[PDB]
Amino acid sequence: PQITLWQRPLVTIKIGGQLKEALLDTGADDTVLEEMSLPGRWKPKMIGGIGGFIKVRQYDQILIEICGHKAIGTVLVGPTPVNIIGRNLLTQIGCTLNF
Amino acid sequence: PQITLWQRPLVTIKIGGQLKEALLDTGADDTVLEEMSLPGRWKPKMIGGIGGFIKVRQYDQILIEICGHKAIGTVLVGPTPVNIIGRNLLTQIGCTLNF
Ligand SMILES: Cc1nc(CN2CCN([C@H](C(=O)N[C@@H](Cc3ccccc3)[C@H](O)CN(CC(C)C)S(=O)(=O)c3ccc(/C=N/O)cc3)C(C)C)C2=O)cs1
């Protein structure tokens, strides 16, 4: 589909069964998600945003549907404003910037 | 021009006679660069996100040169960790996500 940034590129995502509205973000490298429970074990990850580094959990190889395109991968979880799908999951669904 | 997301979407920009590198960020409400002197008056503002907030100066009606395309509109100045081009200026050069 073609999305125009006049608004926040917010889309529905399916992770673990529940639907969640996330933010498509070319700025972020990874996909950070809001506090939630997910399968398996997690590793520790430091990520520094516009306001500093925080500790987030990391579950690799996680199946998430993004706007209708099943993708499986690293999903960082921690204290984030909104859900954020980063390039790791953007390259999967085949996302691109065009102007 | 199709910009892939295998790496960070960094493109050269020109502002205030200067030349700086900046991350195309659809996940960025507005454009915000690192400390630099901008013309005009300004109103202070704060911005949240991963890590919290940061105080920034908000200069409006500012001309910018992205990839050659000329865009106009607000620009934030502050301790951001990297040069960010937001949706407010992206919409101008006509940028979009595709998959
Ligand atoms: C060190 C470095 N490390 C990286 C990679 N990194 C480091 C961290 N990171 C992601 C990340 O936080 N990306 C940021 C951009 C950014 C890029 C590089 C450094 C810092 C921030 C988002 O795309 C935009 N944010 C909104 C979002 C949080 C809702 S904003 O900046 O807070 C924001 C901007 C403008 C306004 C304006 N209002 O009006 C409001 C909020 C994390 C989630 C993983 C990333 O890709 C690059 S350099």
PDB file of C-alpha atoms and ligand atoms in Angstrom:
ATOM      1  CA  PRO A   1       0.000   0.000   0.000  1.00  0.00           C
ATOM      2  CA  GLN A   2       1.172   3.586  -0.221  1.00  0.00           C
ATOM      3  CA  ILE A   3       1.234   5.596   2.979  1.00  0.00           C
ATOM      4  CA  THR A   4       1.621   9.363   3.172  1.00  0.00           C
ATOM      5  CA  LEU A   5       3.274  10.886   6.237  1.00  0.00           C
ATOM      6  CA  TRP A   6       0.781  13.783   6.555  1.00  0.00           C
ATOM      7  CA  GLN A   7      -0.316  11.771   9.562  1.00  0.00           C
ATOM      8  CA  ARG A   8       1.508   9.350  11.852  1.00  0.00           C
ATOM      9  CA  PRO A   9       1.959   6.112   9.862  1.00  0.00           C
ATOM     10  CA  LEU A  10       0.095   4.093  12.562  1.00  0.00           C
ATOM     11  CA  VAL A  11      -0.963   0.553  11.497  1.00  0.00           C
ATOM     12  CA  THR A  12      -2.514  -2.524  13.104  1.00  0.00           C
ATOM     13  CA  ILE A  13      -0.187  -5.364  14.070  1.00  0.00           C
ATOM     14  CA  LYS A  14      -0.896  -8.931  15.158  1.00  0.00           C
ATOM     15  CA  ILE A  15       1.498 -10.359  17.750  1.00  0.00           C
ATOM     16  CA  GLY A  16       0.543 -13.383  19.812  1.00  0.00           C
ATOM     17  CA  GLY A  17      -3.111 -13.121  18.818  1.00  0.00           C
ATOM     18  CA  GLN A  18      -4.042  -9.682  20.093  1.00  0.00           C
ATOM     19  CA  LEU A  19      -4.144  -6.816  17.634  1.00  0.00           C
ATOM     20  CA  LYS A  20      -2.042  -3.765  18.449  1.00  0.00           C
ATOM     21  CA  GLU A  21      -1.697  -0.368  16.757  1.00  0.00           C
ATOM     22  CA  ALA A  22       1.994   0.370  16.196  1.00  0.00           C
ATOM     23  CA  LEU A  23       4.060   3.094  14.556  1.00  0.00           C
ATOM     24  CA  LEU A  24       5.962   2.421  11.293  1.00  0.00           C
ATOM     25  CA  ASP A  25       9.345   4.002  11.936  1.00  0.00           C
ATOM     26  CA  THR A  26      12.280   4.260   9.508  1.00  0.00           C
ATOM     27  CA  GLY A  27      14.181   6.132  12.195  1.00  0.00           C
ATOM     28  CA  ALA A  28      14.384   3.235  14.612  1.00  0.00           C
ATOM     29  CA  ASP A  29      16.718   0.307  13.800  1.00  0.00           C
ATOM     30  CA  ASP A  30      14.808  -2.232  15.868  1.00  0.00           C
ATOM     31  CA  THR A  31      11.187  -2.795  16.785  1.00  0.00           C
ATOM     32  CA  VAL A  32      10.431  -1.726  20.303  1.00  0.00           C
ATOM     33  CA  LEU A  33       7.104  -2.805  21.700  1.00  0.00           C
ATOM     34  CA  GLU A  34       5.219  -1.837  24.841  1.00  0.00           C
ATOM     35  CA  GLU A  35       5.313  -3.947  27.988  1.00  0.00           C
ATOM     36  CA  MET A  36       3.747  -7.311  27.173  1.00  0.00           C
ATOM     37  CA  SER A  37       4.348 -11.042  27.627  1.00  0.00           C
ATOM     38  CA  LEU A  38       5.971 -13.163  24.894  1.00  0.00           C
ATOM     39  CA  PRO A  39       7.310 -16.754  24.639  1.00  0.00           C
ATOM     40  CA  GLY A  40      10.832 -18.022  25.244  1.00  0.00           C
ATOM     41  CA  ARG A  41      13.760 -16.354  26.983  1.00  0.00           C
ATOM     42  CA  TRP A  42      15.037 -12.792  26.533  1.00  0.00           C
ATOM     43  CA  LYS A  43      18.529 -11.196  26.367  1.00  0.00           C
ATOM     44  CA  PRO A  44      19.391  -7.713  27.721  1.00  0.00           C
ATOM     45  CA  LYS A  45      19.564  -4.734  25.348  1.00  0.00           C
ATOM     46  CA  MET A  46      20.531  -1.080  25.732  1.00  0.00           C
ATOM     47  CA  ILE A  47      18.960   1.435  23.382  1.00  0.00           C
ATOM     48  CA  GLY A  48      19.485   5.169  23.576  1.00  0.00           C
ATOM     49  CA  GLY A  49      16.753   7.377  22.183  1.00  0.00           C
ATOM     50  CA  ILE A  50      16.176  11.123  22.028  1.00  0.00           C
ATOM     51  CA  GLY A  51      16.196  11.065  25.808  1.00  0.00           C
ATOM     52  CA  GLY A  52      18.750   8.412  26.684  1.00  0.00           C
ATOM     53  CA  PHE A  53      19.471   4.697  26.990  1.00  0.00           C
ATOM     54  CA  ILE A  54      17.032   2.324  28.666  1.00  0.00           C
ATOM     55  CA  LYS A  55      17.036  -1.390  29.402  1.00  0.00           C
ATOM     56  CA  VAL A  56      14.732  -3.380  27.145  1.00  0.00           C
ATOM     57  CA  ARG A  57      14.072  -7.082  26.835  1.00  0.00           C
ATOM     58  CA  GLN A  58      14.799  -8.942  23.619  1.00  0.00           C
ATOM     59  CA  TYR A  59      12.933 -11.980  22.325  1.00  0.00           C
ATOM     60  CA  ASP A  60      14.401 -13.146  18.991  1.00  0.00           C
ATOM     61  CA  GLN A  61      12.444 -14.959  16.294  1.00  0.00           C
ATOM     62  CA  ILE A  62       8.997 -13.644  17.231  1.00  0.00           C
ATOM     63  CA  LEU A  63       6.087 -13.956  14.792  1.00  0.00           C
ATOM     64  CA  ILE A  64       4.306 -10.670  14.213  1.00  0.00           C
ATOM     65  CA  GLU A  65       1.826  -9.699  11.529  1.00  0.00           C
ATOM     66  CA  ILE A  66       2.428  -6.165  10.359  1.00  0.00           C
ATOM     67  CA  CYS A  67      -0.321  -4.632   8.277  1.00  0.00           C
ATOM     68  CA  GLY A  68      -0.987  -8.027   6.754  1.00  0.00           C
ATOM     69  CA  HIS A  69       2.578  -9.300   6.221  1.00  0.00           C
ATOM     70  CA  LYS A  70       3.696 -12.106   8.535  1.00  0.00           C
ATOM     71  CA  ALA A  71       7.240 -11.481   9.724  1.00  0.00           C
ATOM     72  CA  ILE A  72       9.368 -13.264  12.324  1.00  0.00           C
ATOM     73  CA  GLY A  73      12.058 -11.602  14.341  1.00  0.00           C
ATOM     74  CA  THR A  74      13.604  -9.667  17.168  1.00  0.00           C
ATOM     75  CA  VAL A  75      11.031  -7.720  19.148  1.00  0.00           C
ATOM     76  CA  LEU A  76      12.330  -5.362  21.786  1.00  0.00           C
ATOM     77  CA  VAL A  77      10.038  -4.678  24.705  1.00  0.00           C
ATOM     78  CA  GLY A  78      10.452  -1.996  27.321  1.00  0.00           C
ATOM     79  CA  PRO A  79       9.160   1.446  28.332  1.00  0.00           C
ATOM     80  CA  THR A  80       8.124   3.079  25.074  1.00  0.00           C
ATOM     81  CA  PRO A  81       5.536   5.768  24.302  1.00  0.00           C
ATOM     82  CA  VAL A  82       3.963   3.895  21.378  1.00  0.00           C
ATOM     83  CA  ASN A  83       4.636   0.577  19.693  1.00  0.00           C
ATOM     84  CA  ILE A  84       7.371   0.902  17.141  1.00  0.00           C
ATOM     85  CA  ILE A  85       8.209  -1.349  14.216  1.00  0.00           C
ATOM     86  CA  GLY A  86      11.786  -0.741  13.117  1.00  0.00           C
ATOM     87  CA  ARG A  87      13.805  -1.520   9.998  1.00  0.00           C
ATOM     88  CA  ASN A  88      14.421  -5.129  11.126  1.00  0.00           C
ATOM     89  CA  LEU A  89      10.715  -5.773  10.576  1.00  0.00           C
ATOM     90  CA  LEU A  90      10.367  -3.190   7.827  1.00  0.00           C
ATOM     91  CA  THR A  91      12.846  -4.965   5.579  1.00  0.00           C
ATOM     92  CA  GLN A  92      10.848  -8.106   6.161  1.00  0.00           C
ATOM     93  CA  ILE A  93       7.446  -6.862   5.010  1.00  0.00           C
ATOM     94  CA  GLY A  94       9.347  -5.217   2.145  1.00  0.00           C
ATOM     95  CA  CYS A  95       8.991  -1.565   3.184  1.00  0.00           C
ATOM     96  CA  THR A  96      10.689   1.276   1.252  1.00  0.00           C
ATOM     97  CA  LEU A  97      10.984   5.081   1.233  1.00  0.00           C
ATOM     98  CA  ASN A  98       9.960   6.790  -1.986  1.00  0.00           C
ATOM     99  CA  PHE A  99       9.970  10.425  -3.048  1.00  0.00           C
TER     100      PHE A  99
ATOM    101  CA  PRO B   1      14.345   7.434  -6.004  1.00  0.00           C
ATOM    102  CA  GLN B   2      13.660   4.277  -4.045  1.00  0.00           C
ATOM    103  CA  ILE B   3      15.335   4.243  -0.645  1.00  0.00           C
ATOM    104  CA  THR B   4      15.780   0.793   0.865  1.00  0.00           C
ATOM    105  CA  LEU B   5      15.808   0.136   4.585  1.00  0.00           C
ATOM    106  CA  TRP B   6      18.666  -2.374   4.823  1.00  0.00           C
ATOM    107  CA  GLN B   7      20.680   0.438   6.435  1.00  0.00           C
ATOM    108  CA  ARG B   8      19.810   3.712   8.127  1.00  0.00           C
ATOM    109  CA  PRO B   9      18.055   6.047   5.633  1.00  0.00           C
ATOM    110  CA  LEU B  10      20.692   8.799   5.853  1.00  0.00           C
ATOM    111  CA  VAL B  11      20.623  11.565   3.241  1.00  0.00           C
ATOM    112  CA  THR B  12      22.542  14.794   2.890  1.00  0.00           C
ATOM    113  CA  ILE B  13      20.649  17.996   3.638  1.00  0.00           C
ATOM    114  CA  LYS B  14      21.498  21.695   3.424  1.00  0.00           C
ATOM    115  CA  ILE B  15      20.270  24.292   5.897  1.00  0.00           C
ATOM    116  CA  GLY B  16      21.594  27.725   6.789  1.00  0.00           C
ATOM    117  CA  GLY B  17      24.290  27.556   4.151  1.00  0.00           C
ATOM    118  CA  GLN B  18      25.632  24.531   6.023  1.00  0.00           C
ATOM    119  CA  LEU B  19      25.634  20.868   4.976  1.00  0.00           C
ATOM    120  CA  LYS B  20      24.621  18.124   7.392  1.00  0.00           C
ATOM    121  CA  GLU B  21      23.766  14.415   7.328  1.00  0.00           C
ATOM    122  CA  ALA B  22      20.348  13.481   8.721  1.00  0.00           C
ATOM    123  CA  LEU B  23      18.227  10.382   9.235  1.00  0.00           C
ATOM    124  CA  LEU B  24      15.006  10.228   7.261  1.00  0.00           C
ATOM    125  CA  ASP B  25      12.570   9.517  10.068  1.00  0.00           C
ATOM    126  CA  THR B  26       8.872   8.819   9.399  1.00  0.00           C
ATOM    127  CA  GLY B  27       8.679   8.006  13.094  1.00  0.00           C
ATOM    128  CA  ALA B  28       9.720  11.578  13.866  1.00  0.00           C
ATOM    129  CA  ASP B  29       6.821  14.000  14.337  1.00  0.00           C
ATOM    130  CA  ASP B  30       9.070  16.883  13.504  1.00  0.00           C
ATOM    131  CA  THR B  31      12.532  17.706  12.271  1.00  0.00           C
ATOM    132  CA  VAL B  32      15.120  18.281  14.996  1.00  0.00           C
ATOM    133  CA  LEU B  33      18.841  18.869  14.595  1.00  0.00           C
ATOM    134  CA  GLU B  34      21.761  19.186  17.050  1.00  0.00           C
ATOM    135  CA  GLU B  35      22.787  22.586  18.427  1.00  0.00           C
ATOM    136  CA  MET B  36      23.159  25.083  15.631  1.00  0.00           C
ATOM    137  CA  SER B  37      22.336  28.745  15.159  1.00  0.00           C
ATOM    138  CA  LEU B  38      19.084  29.409  13.286  1.00  0.00           C
ATOM    139  CA  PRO B  39      17.624  32.783  12.206  1.00  0.00           C
ATOM    140  CA  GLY B  40      14.344  34.248  13.375  1.00  0.00           C
ATOM    141  CA  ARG B  41      12.704  34.087  16.771  1.00  0.00           C
ATOM    142  CA  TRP B  42      11.995  30.857  18.656  1.00  0.00           C
ATOM    143  CA  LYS B  43       9.798  29.293  21.320  1.00  0.00           C
ATOM    144  CA  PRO B  44      11.154  26.600  23.640  1.00  0.00           C
ATOM    145  CA  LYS B  45       9.617  23.123  23.513  1.00  0.00           C
ATOM    146  CA  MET B  46      10.182  19.662  24.975  1.00  0.00           C
ATOM    147  CA  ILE B  47      10.118  16.251  23.252  1.00  0.00           C
ATOM    148  CA  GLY B  48       9.589  12.759  24.631  1.00  0.00           C
ATOM    149  CA  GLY B  49      10.283   9.325  23.228  1.00  0.00           C
ATOM    150  CA  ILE B  50      12.661   6.503  24.118  1.00  0.00           C
ATOM    151  CA  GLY B  51      14.571   7.736  27.119  1.00  0.00           C
ATOM    152  CA  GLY B  52      12.254  10.583  28.032  1.00  0.00           C
ATOM    153  CA  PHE B  53      12.372  14.238  26.927  1.00  0.00           C
ATOM    154  CA  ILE B  54      14.793  16.985  25.884  1.00  0.00           C
ATOM    155  CA  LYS B  55      14.404  20.773  25.772  1.00  0.00           C
ATOM    156  CA  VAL B  56      14.765  22.110  22.252  1.00  0.00           C
ATOM    157  CA  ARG B  57      14.421  25.455  20.514  1.00  0.00           C
ATOM    158  CA  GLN B  58      11.683  25.585  17.930  1.00  0.00           C
ATOM    159  CA  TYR B  59      12.408  27.738  14.899  1.00  0.00           C
ATOM    160  CA  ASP B  60       9.548  27.809  12.409  1.00  0.00           C
ATOM    161  CA  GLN B  61       9.405  28.801   8.725  1.00  0.00           C
ATOM    162  CA  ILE B  62      12.899  27.450   8.006  1.00  0.00           C
ATOM    163  CA  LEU B  63      14.133  26.498   4.511  1.00  0.00           C
ATOM    164  CA  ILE B  64      15.792  23.121   3.944  1.00  0.00           C
ATOM    165  CA  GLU B  65      17.506  21.240   1.108  1.00  0.00           C
ATOM    166  CA  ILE B  66      16.815  17.468   1.179  1.00  0.00           C
ATOM    167  CA  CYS B  67      18.399  15.511  -1.678  1.00  0.00           C
ATOM    168  CA  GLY B  68      17.982  18.657  -3.727  1.00  0.00           C
ATOM    169  CA  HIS B  69      14.278  19.038  -3.034  1.00  0.00           C
ATOM    170  CA  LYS B  70      13.526  22.314  -1.206  1.00  0.00           C
ATOM    171  CA  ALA B  71      11.203  22.114   1.823  1.00  0.00           C
ATOM    172  CA  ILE B  72       9.971  24.696   4.346  1.00  0.00           C
ATOM    173  CA  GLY B  73       8.642  24.538   7.897  1.00  0.00           C
ATOM    174  CA  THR B  74       9.493  24.149  11.586  1.00  0.00           C
ATOM    175  CA  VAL B  75      12.849  22.839  12.793  1.00  0.00           C
ATOM    176  CA  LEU B  76      13.762  21.796  16.311  1.00  0.00           C
ATOM    177  CA  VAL B  77      17.250  22.451  17.755  1.00  0.00           C
ATOM    178  CA  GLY B  78      18.568  20.641  20.812  1.00  0.00           C
ATOM    179  CA  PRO B  79      20.556  17.772  22.360  1.00  0.00           C
ATOM    180  CA  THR B  80      19.102  15.211  19.966  1.00  0.00           C
ATOM    181  CA  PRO B  81      21.628  12.382  19.470  1.00  0.00           C
ATOM    182  CA  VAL B  82      21.389  12.498  15.656  1.00  0.00           C
ATOM    183  CA  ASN B  83      20.049  14.709  12.844  1.00  0.00           C
ATOM    184  CA  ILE B  84      16.393  13.941  12.279  1.00  0.00           C
ATOM    185  CA  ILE B  85      14.146  14.934   9.350  1.00  0.00           C
ATOM    186  CA  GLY B  86      10.497  14.534  10.400  1.00  0.00           C
ATOM    187  CA  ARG B  87       7.141  14.068   8.686  1.00  0.00           C
ATOM    188  CA  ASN B  88       6.538  17.847   8.580  1.00  0.00           C
ATOM    189  CA  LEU B  89       9.302  18.316   6.004  1.00  0.00           C
ATOM    190  CA  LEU B  90       9.093  14.827   4.530  1.00  0.00           C
ATOM    191  CA  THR B  91       5.528  15.415   3.370  1.00  0.00           C
ATOM    192  CA  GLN B  92       6.836  18.441   1.505  1.00  0.00           C
ATOM    193  CA  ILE B  93       9.359  16.655  -0.694  1.00  0.00           C
ATOM    194  CA  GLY B  94       6.653  14.049  -1.103  1.00  0.00           C
ATOM    195  CA  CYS B  95       7.914  10.949   0.715  1.00  0.00           C
ATOM    196  CA  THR B  96       6.073   7.617   1.329  1.00  0.00           C
ATOM    197  CA  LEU B  97       6.354   4.034   2.689  1.00  0.00           C
ATOM    198  CA  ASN B  98       5.651   1.202   0.274  1.00  0.00           C
ATOM    199  CA  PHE B  99       5.174  -2.536   0.389  1.00  0.00           C
TER     200      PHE B  99
HETATM  201  C1  LIG C   1      23.684   6.419  18.605  1.00  0.00           C
HETATM  202  C2  LIG C   1      22.659   6.079  17.524  1.00  0.00           C
HETATM  203  N1  LIG C   1      21.750   5.100  17.621  1.00  0.00           N
HETATM  204  C3  LIG C   1      20.904   5.009  16.423  1.00  0.00           C
HETATM  205  C4  LIG C   1      19.802   4.003  16.249  1.00  0.00           C
HETATM  206  N2  LIG C   1      18.681   4.147  17.200  1.00  0.00           N
HETATM  207  C5  LIG C   1      18.851   4.580  18.594  1.00  0.00           C
HETATM  208  C6  LIG C   1      17.427   4.570  19.146  1.00  0.00           C
HETATM  209  N3  LIG C   1      16.620   4.128  17.996  1.00  0.00           N
HETATM  210  C7  LIG C   1      15.142   3.965  18.070  1.00  0.00           C
HETATM  211  C8  LIG C   1      14.467   5.372  18.197  1.00  0.00           C
HETATM  212  O1  LIG C   1      14.123   5.791  19.309  1.00  0.00           O
HETATM  213  N4  LIG C   1      14.321   6.068  17.015  1.00  0.00           N
HETATM  214  C9  LIG C   1      13.724   7.430  17.022  1.00  0.00           C
HETATM  215  C10 LIG C   1      14.711   8.356  16.259  1.00  0.00           C
HETATM  216  C11 LIG C   1      16.116   8.302  16.793  1.00  0.00           C
HETATM  217  C12 LIG C   1      17.171   7.893  15.948  1.00  0.00           C
HETATM  218  C13 LIG C   1      18.487   7.825  16.435  1.00  0.00           C
HETATM  219  C14 LIG C   1      18.781   8.158  17.770  1.00  0.00           C
HETATM  220  C15 LIG C   1      17.735   8.569  18.630  1.00  0.00           C
HETATM  221  C16 LIG C   1      16.410   8.639  18.141  1.00  0.00           C
HETATM  222  C17 LIG C   1      12.277   7.452  16.453  1.00  0.00           C
HETATM  223  O2  LIG C   1      12.289   7.068  15.098  1.00  0.00           O
HETATM  224  C18 LIG C   1      11.599   8.846  16.540  1.00  0.00           C
HETATM  225  N5  LIG C   1      11.244   9.114  17.943  1.00  0.00           N
HETATM  226  C19 LIG C   1       9.844   8.871  18.266  1.00  0.00           C
HETATM  227  C20 LIG C   1       9.524   7.433  18.717  1.00  0.00           C
HETATM  228  C21 LIG C   1      10.337   7.070  19.967  1.00  0.00           C
HETATM  229  C22 LIG C   1       8.034   7.285  19.015  1.00  0.00           C
HETATM  230  S1  LIG C   1      11.897  10.603  18.660  1.00  0.00           S
HETATM  231  O3  LIG C   1      13.248  10.705  18.197  1.00  0.00           O
HETATM  232  O4  LIG C   1      11.719  10.401  20.070  1.00  0.00           O
HETATM  233  C23 LIG C   1      11.039  12.101  18.248  1.00  0.00           C
HETATM  234  C24 LIG C   1      11.530  12.929  17.219  1.00  0.00           C
HETATM  235  C25 LIG C   1      10.862  14.134  16.910  1.00  0.00           C
HETATM  236  C26 LIG C   1       9.700  14.514  17.632  1.00  0.00           C
HETATM  237  C27 LIG C   1       9.041  15.776  17.285  1.00  0.00           C
HETATM  238  N6  LIG C   1       7.861  16.167  17.795  1.00  0.00           N
HETATM  239  O5  LIG C   1       7.324  17.389  17.396  1.00  0.00           O
HETATM  240  C28 LIG C   1       9.209  13.677  18.667  1.00  0.00           C
HETATM  241  C29 LIG C   1       9.879  12.472  18.972  1.00  0.00           C
HETATM  242  C30 LIG C   1      14.768   3.039  19.276  1.00  0.00           C
HETATM  243  C31 LIG C   1      13.252   2.826  19.417  1.00  0.00           C
HETATM  244  C32 LIG C   1      15.445   1.659  19.150  1.00  0.00           C
HETATM  245  C33 LIG C   1      17.386   3.896  16.894  1.00  0.00           C
HETATM  246  O6  LIG C   1      16.994   3.521  15.792  1.00  0.00           O
HETATM  247  C34 LIG C   1      21.237   5.927  15.501  1.00  0.00           C
HETATM  248  S2  LIG C   1      22.560   6.960  15.982  1.00  0.00           S
END
